[PDB]
């Protein structure tokens, strides 16, 4: 497989899901300005940020987790982005939501979490350009806390420092100063974000925030190395209990890994290698007849891209290296198409036309766009290229229509680790 395209496609998804007031070497044709007007409740701007699936929901924690993932990849596997040739384009991709978090940052302690109301804007199916539906927004603060949407939020800061402090530092250091408020807001304002935020309960409920505090404390002691994060990651931290899974609500096995790797701490490493044995072939996912490490119905590849992101992680710090590297390129080639087909959209042999997306769901400009394209029995107008949809059954079946919004579903965070892990298999190429 074409890695360096892969690379250069997925990229791509993300750019198809900006909001907000798009620059002037815009790559996707059919996308224009949108949601301009998006701002708080004393009129602060919110423009910007992704969309988060195929609505047009700013939800703030599944963005900020997809940020996170994206900014440890490149971190990790940067030489694989180098090779590929998309290296600057990957940083201007999470530059986007990372000026979205400083905008959302209001003040020390209120940090908006959500711009849109996710039932109004389901109800809706047409381009963002064409939005005409009140889009408010809702934020944390004291009064409404959300420690999980916070110390996430601090963790994209703090991983973008990281990113970003030997090209930009002025940009870097703006993110690094926020990642500390917002944690010290996280650690002094406990609570889960979507009881606060009580629209996102329906779409991104959060099961538990300490995680997430020991979550964005490793990444704050990775960025500062203050003894104090390095506490703080240990008090929310757990060595006894191995993760289920990696992605937006559980953050175990992510702060397990990073403070083993970067932190050198030993005490997280059998947590790390339970993981790392409960995904392999042999251990508790099921895997489909045809190969795919298959958690649950709703985004397996997702789930499946995610622990190969980890699994790629853990062998370049040589943990179960050779078997961490061969489970995660059997998951990401079922992606790419072993199956017969790839899930991914743009990419490969008979890629999904119908991905459950609206804007690739238009035709272009000036035509129409309304429920009749949600119900159209043929592809997609425009091609989301890069776009990993959630993926097929546990028997490997898969009918790319647009109404199964299950198998069919794309999102930022289907995509985080995804890409991560295609950088770290093209950096691979280069070692070998
Ligand atoms: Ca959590
Ligand atoms: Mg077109
Ligand atoms: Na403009």
Same mark, same amino acid.
């Given at each position: ?11 791509? @998804?993300?750019?198809a899901?900006?909001?907000? %007031? ?5 790559? =996707?044709?059919?996308?224009? #300005? ?6 708080g409740?004393?009129?602060? #701007? ?8 195929? #609505? ?6 599944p963005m &900020?987790?997809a940020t ?8 990790? @596997?940067? #030489?694989?982005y ?7 384009? &990957? ?14 940052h209001?003040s020390?302690?209120? @940090?908006?979490?959500?711009?849109? %109301? $996710? ?20 934020? =944390? ?12 939020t601090? &963790?994209a ?19 690094l $100063? ?6 010290? @807001?996280?650690? *002094?304002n ?34 500062t ?5 390095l ?16 992605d937006?609500?559980?953050?175990i ?15 997280f490493?059998?947590?790390v290698?339970?993981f ?9 996912? +099921? ?7 298959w ?15 980890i ?6 710090? *040589?943990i ?17 198409? %072993? ?9 490969? *042999?008979?890629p999904?036309?119908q991905?459950?997306?609206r ?22 107008? +425009? ?10 059954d ?15 579903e794309?999102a ?10 295609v $950088?770290?298999?093209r ?6």
């Amino acid at each position: 497989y074409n890695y360096d395209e892969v690379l250069e496609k997925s990229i791509l @998804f993300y750019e198809a899901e900006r909001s907000g %007031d798009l620059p002037a070497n815009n790559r =996707i044709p059919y996308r224009g #300005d949108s949601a301009l007007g998006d701002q708080g409740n004393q009129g602060q #701007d919110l423009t910007g940020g992704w969309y988060d699936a195929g #609505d047009h929901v700013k939800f703030g924690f599944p963005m &900020a987790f997809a940020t996170t993932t994206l900014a440890w990849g490149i971190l990790e @596997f940067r #030489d694989g982005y180098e090779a590929a040739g998309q290296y600057n384009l &990957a940083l201007d991709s999470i530059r986007w939501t990372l000026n979205y978090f400083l905008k959302a940052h209001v003040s020390d302690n209120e @940090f908006y979490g959500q711009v849109g %109301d $996710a039932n109004t804007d389901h109800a809706y199916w047409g381009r963002p350009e064409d939005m005409t539906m009140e889009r408010p927004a809702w934020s =944390i603060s004291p009064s409404a806390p959300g420690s999980d949407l916070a110390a996430e939020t601090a &963790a994209a800061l703090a991983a973008g420092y990281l990113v970003f402090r030997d090209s930009d530092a002025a940009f870097a250091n703006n993110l690094l $100063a926020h990642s500390r408020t917002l944690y010290d @807001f996280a650690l *002094n304002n406990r609570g889960i974000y979507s009881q606060s935020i009580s629209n996102a309960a329906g779409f991104y409920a959060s099961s538990a925030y300490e995680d997430e505090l020991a979550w964005g404390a490793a990444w704050l002691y990775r960025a500062t190395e203050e003894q104090e994060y390095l506490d703080r990651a240990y008090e929310f931290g757990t060595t006894t209990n191995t993760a289920w899974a990696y992605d937006w609500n559980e953050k175990i096995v992510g702060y397990q890994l990073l403070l083993t790797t970067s932190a050198g701490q030993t005490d997280f490493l059998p947590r790390v290698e339970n993981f790392l044995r409960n995904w392999f072939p042999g251990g508790s996912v +099921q895997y489909t007849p045809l190969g795919l490490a298959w958690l649950a119905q709703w985004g397996p590849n997702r789930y499946a891209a995610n622990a190969a992101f980890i699994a790629l992680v853990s062998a370049k710090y *040589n943990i179960l290296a050779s078997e961490s590297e061969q489970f995660a390129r059997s998951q990401i080639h079922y992606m790419l198409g %072993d199956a017969g087909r790839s899930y991914v959209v743009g990419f490969g *042999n008979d890629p999904p036309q119908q991905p459950h997306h609206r804007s690739s769901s238009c035709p272009d400009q000036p035509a129409e766009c309304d429920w009749d394209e949600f119900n159209q029995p043929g592809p997609n107008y +425009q091609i989301l290229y890069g776009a990993l949809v959630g993926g097929p059954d546990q028997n490997d079946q898969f009918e790319d229509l647009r109404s199964d919004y299950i198998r069919n579903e794309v999102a930022n965070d289907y995509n985080a680790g995804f890409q991560g892990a295609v $950088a770290a298999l093209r950096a691979i190429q280069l070692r070998d």
